[PDB]
Design a protein around this ligand. Structure first.
Ligand code: DTP
Ligand code: CA
Ligand code: CA
Ligand code: CA
Ligand code: CA
Length: 903
DNA sequence: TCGGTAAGCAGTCCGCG
DNA sequence: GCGGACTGCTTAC
């Protein structure tokens, strides 16, 4: 097999590399790497090295990395550019792996772990590590085993051994319901003292040294706790055994309630699953407890136990250990679904970076571009200092707030990367400038053609048409991968709907799910077999289709994110290829494209409808247009349609056969106007929206920019079994909105769009009547808690103190003296509830760590003093008022002359 | 050696016979 | 008690 790296580190003048060799064995080597950098030289000198602008360079081979770094400093002081890769481990990887890396994930040791620490005096701070570690579960991907280290004797209680037999039993039978599929993979190791537990764990760690280290919150809790606990008991040198190179870095944040620290373990790639989830999931959650996320992702119930966690080991050691095990497994279950570790590996090896650098689009792109240029013997420019400067972005149309009955939307494929490719935007493809006209003049095609030689953007930039740019070249490769995966995702989505349709008429038979690849549209023969399947097999197929869809979603959305990241990186001052000429060349072109095609679509639809000057495009954001299809439906006459699906089919055909060709013609003209390298403005139909035929539903509404709701029957070629609400920006979509309020608002919207005003009024009346009976957590608002200390004046709110922070300060005063009360953590999220006047908390609101029940000593007071009236008005009534006023509907029947009668 | 902009709404402070 | 200038938070691209 071909070799591939596992980890790489620079330590002084040494590169330390862990890798897999040709025989598939894990090896480690220390290399006294001799790096090269480059200086511009005169033209009279024969060289094979050229910078990206074709200027000749001389290579400087250094005896060591420090010598190379020192030369950079001298060059800075002289005032001359020091070219080449200054992150020497990237140069090392590029030199050692001068080919496309084919990695074998089965040879990579992925460790998932978590620890337990009983603490009778508050949260066990990792920086202090004053309490015994009393459990570790460490899962090894190579062994496929859960190694459980269980402390039996501790100053906080002596306990009996954990029982695997009781662990496997149902909870309803007194067991812990440790999943059956992992029972046989558990290796249980009890210890009579912590010193032997930890010594054994370190020996274990030496034998099975993680390459990828993950788990939930491991970076901020498990890792620094283990490191500091070992340091306190055995000494710092022993703690450093957690690094295969015996080197660590301790970073102390300290601000300001307690000192926290992050430990860098050289030779390990830590990918805290919490950080992977936040980067790659595209959710915003009200809480990031593992219980919350596991319920969201897997539909598994909370791990239930009696009493506080500080007393769980002593009261129920059996459950304590089982829950430690299940917690580790839950992260594995989330990854089996989401496939973020797979993504990280794919991306890391593609770029040739440390795997943990996937968190940085700048590092990733620097490495991709460096490797690309190096293959051509080109020399990368030195990074330079730039002041931060605001610059213009996308255009968003101001919509007329209203109900909109029939809507069809259209959207440009991968816009910013497509602009890069179309215009040929790269640091080295700049040909010059032209004198700009007002943007409106380009949009309306009245401005002079910028150039008949070069490829242009309406920001004034010109690019070479007849040469390749490294940015377009490399962005295209990732775009093409993205496109492949999005194809698989959409096919799986379409296949899902086929299964949902079949589930309306399931067969009474004993059968099996079909052996199919869900990444491809089902053949006619598969569809025939599906119509004969039982409910049991159909539901299993639907699960597999949806898992396939999620896998494709992960793969495509994050490749989309990486390429959009490159467009944004051009506007980040720390990017090697920072250039506002290129950043604004993209965004300005986008503004033109949207407004150009708005004009073209209005022109076209007026023409085919036999009218002039009507506004068909009601809204657009960045690269999308929303077209009112009322006149199109009315042109043929609504009475001509047999059912909803009939008019949906008609609009689908209209969009594809008439509008898209006109849109294509419009953009081809824009391309020749800007004299661009390649036409890549591909704007396809996205949503077909409207009310069910014959209903009083309003179809859709806009309240303003970035705020709308649509009843969608078809999305990007997926014809839904059941209509789906597309809601953007409204409170239903915000993590700050109470859970039960999100639900009620969405149903209010569903009724508006699908059923009409009377239906809405019926639901509103019920919700208002029952509101006070909802669980307090379901009706609590959520906020991130930033800069708490800033507004903390003797436990009381200082000037301009935000509402949620005031809630936290109220909570802090309420729990003073309480030892078991959970502290609010700076930067994390809190539930917030308003309090009625005269409450014993002494303020208008209270806030507590999100995803948790509020502590028992103040729970009864909060429930007694909760302001339901304020809660309902602020979170439910006020947003609903916004929706209905925009839609010209009432959520409450207004008084009229009819009230004089007895109906 | 760490490494995108546009834009809506809730809330505080302030003016306000 | 509301509107206006400002911070903060959050979402749509
Ligand atoms: N998360 C983001 N980071 C940076 N730029 C973004 C992001 N989301 C959107 N943009 C910018 C760049 C996009 O090309 C442009 C249009 O957004 P959008 O339509 O969501 O995606 P897209 O056009 O890149 O891909 P798609 O093919 O899925 O439509 O807005
Ligand atoms: Ca735990
Ligand atoms: Ca798009
Ligand atoms: Ca059937
Ligand atoms: Ca879009």
């Amino acid at each position: 097999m071909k070799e591939f790296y596992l980890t790489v580190e620079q330590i002084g003048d040494s590169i330390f590399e862990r890798y897999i060799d040709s025989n598939g064995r894990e090896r480690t080597r220390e290399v006294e790497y001799k790096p090269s950098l480059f200086a511009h030289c005169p033209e009279s000198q024969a060289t094979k090295y050229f910078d990206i602008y074709g200027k000749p360079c001389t290579r400087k081979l250094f005896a060591n990395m420090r010598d190379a770094s020192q030369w950079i400093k001298r060059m800075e002081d002289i005032g001359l550019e020091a070219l080449g890769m200054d992150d020497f481990k990237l140069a090392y990887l590029s030199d050692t792996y001068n080919y496309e890396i084919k990695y074998d994930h089965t040879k990579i040791r992925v460790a998932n772990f978590d620890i337990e620490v009983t603490s009778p005096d508050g949260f066990p701070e990792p920086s202090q590590a004053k309490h015994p570690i009393d459990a570790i579960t460490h899962y090894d991907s190579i062994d496929d085993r859960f190694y459980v280290f269980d402390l039996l004797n501790s100053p906080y209680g002596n306990v009996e051994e954990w029982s695997i037999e009781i662990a496997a039993k149902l909870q309803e039978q007194g067991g812990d319901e440790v999943p059956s599929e992992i029972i046989d993979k558990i290796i249980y190791m009890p210890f009579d003292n912590e010193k032997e537990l930890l010594m054994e764990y370190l020996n274990f760690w030496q034998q099975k040294t993680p390459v990828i280290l993950t788990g939930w919150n491991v970076e901020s809790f498990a890792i620094p706790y283990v490191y500091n606990r070992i340091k306190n008991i055995f000494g710092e040198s022993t703690a450093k055994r957690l690094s295969p190179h015996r080197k660590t870095r301790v970073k102390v944040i300290e601000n300001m309630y307690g000192s926290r620290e992050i430990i860098t373990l050289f030779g390990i790639s830590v990918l805290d699953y919490i950080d992977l989830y936040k980067k790659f999931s595209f959710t915003n959650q009200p809480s990031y407890s593992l219980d919350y996320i596991s319920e969201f992702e897997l539909n598994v119930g909370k791990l239930k136990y009696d009493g506080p966690i500080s007393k769980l080991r002593e009261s129920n050691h059996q459950r304590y250990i089982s829950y430690n095990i299940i917690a580790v497994y839950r992260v594995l279950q989330i990854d089996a679904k989401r496939q973020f570790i797979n993504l990280s590996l794919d991306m890391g090896y593609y770029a040739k970076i440390q795997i943990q650098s996937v968190f940085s689009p700048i590092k990733t792109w620097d490495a991709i571009i460096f490797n690309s240029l190096k293959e051509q013997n080109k020399v990368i420019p030195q990074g330079r200092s730039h002041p931060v400067q605001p610059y213009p972005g996308a255009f968003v149309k101001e919509p007329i707030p209203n109900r909109y009955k029939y809507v069809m939307s259209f959207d440009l494929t991968s816009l910013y990367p497509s602009i890069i490719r179309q215009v040929n935007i790269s640091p080295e493809t700049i040909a010059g400038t032209f004198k700009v006209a007002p943007l409106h003049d380009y949009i309306n095609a009245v401005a002079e053609r910028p150039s008949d030689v070069y490829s242009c953007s309406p920001n004034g930039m010109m690019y070479y048409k007849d040469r390749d740019g490294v940015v377009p070249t490399e962005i295209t490769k990732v775009f093409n991968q993205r496109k492949e995966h999005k194809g698989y995702m959409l096919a799986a989505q379409r296949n899902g709907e086929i299964i949902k349709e079949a589930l309306h008429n399931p067969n009474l038979s004993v059968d099996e799910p079909l052996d199919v690849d869900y990444r491809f549209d089902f053949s006619d023969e598969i569809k025939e077999k599906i119509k004969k399947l039982s409910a049991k097999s159909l539901n299993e197929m639907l699960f597999r289709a949806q898992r396939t869809e999620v896998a494709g979603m992960t793969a495509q959305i994050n490749r989309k994110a990486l390429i959009n990241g490159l467009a944004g990186a051009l506007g980040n001052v720390w990017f090697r290829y920072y250039d506002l000429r290129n950043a604004t060349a993209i965004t300005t072109f986008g503004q033109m494209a949207l407004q150009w095609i708005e004009r073209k679509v209005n022109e076209y639809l007026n023409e085919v409808c036999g009218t002039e000057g009507e506004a068909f495009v009601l809204y657009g954001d960045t690269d999308s247009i929303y077209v009112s299809a009322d006149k199109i439906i009315d042109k043929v006459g609504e009475s001509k349609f047999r059912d909803t699906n009939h008019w949906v089919d008609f609009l689908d055909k209209f969009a594809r056969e008439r509008m898209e060709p006109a849109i294509d013609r419009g953009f081809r003209e824009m391309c020749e106007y800007m004299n661009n390298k390649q036409h890549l403005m591909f704007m396809d139909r996205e949503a077909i929206a409207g009310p069910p035929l014959g209903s009083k539903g309003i179809g859709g509404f806009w309240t303003g920019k970035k705020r709308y709701a649509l009843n969608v029957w078809d999305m990007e070629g997926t014809r839904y079994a059941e209509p789906k609400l597309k809601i953007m920006g409204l409170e239903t979509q915000k993590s700050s909105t109470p859970k039960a309020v999100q639900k009620a608002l969405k149903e209010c919207i569903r009724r508006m769009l699908q059923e009409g005003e009377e239906s809405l009024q019926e639901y509103f009346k019920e919700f208002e009547k029952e509101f006070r009976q909802l669980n307090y957590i379901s009706i609590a608002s959520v906020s991130s808690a930033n800069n708490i200390a800033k507004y903390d004046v003797g436990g009381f709110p200082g000037p301009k103190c935000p509402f949620h922070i005031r809630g936290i300060l109220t909570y802090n005063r309420a729990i003073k003296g309480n030892i078991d009360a959970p502290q609010v953590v700076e930067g994390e999220k809190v539930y917030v509830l308003p309090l009625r006047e005269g409450n014993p908390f002494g303020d208008k609101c209270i806030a507590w760590p999100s995803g948790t029940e509020i502590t028992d000593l103040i729970k009864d007071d909060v429930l007694h003093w909760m302001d339901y009236t304020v809660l309902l008005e602020k979170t439910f009534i006020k947003p609903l008022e916004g929706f209905t006023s925009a839609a010209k509907l009432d959520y409450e029947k207004k008084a009229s002359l009819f009230d004089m009668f007895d109906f």
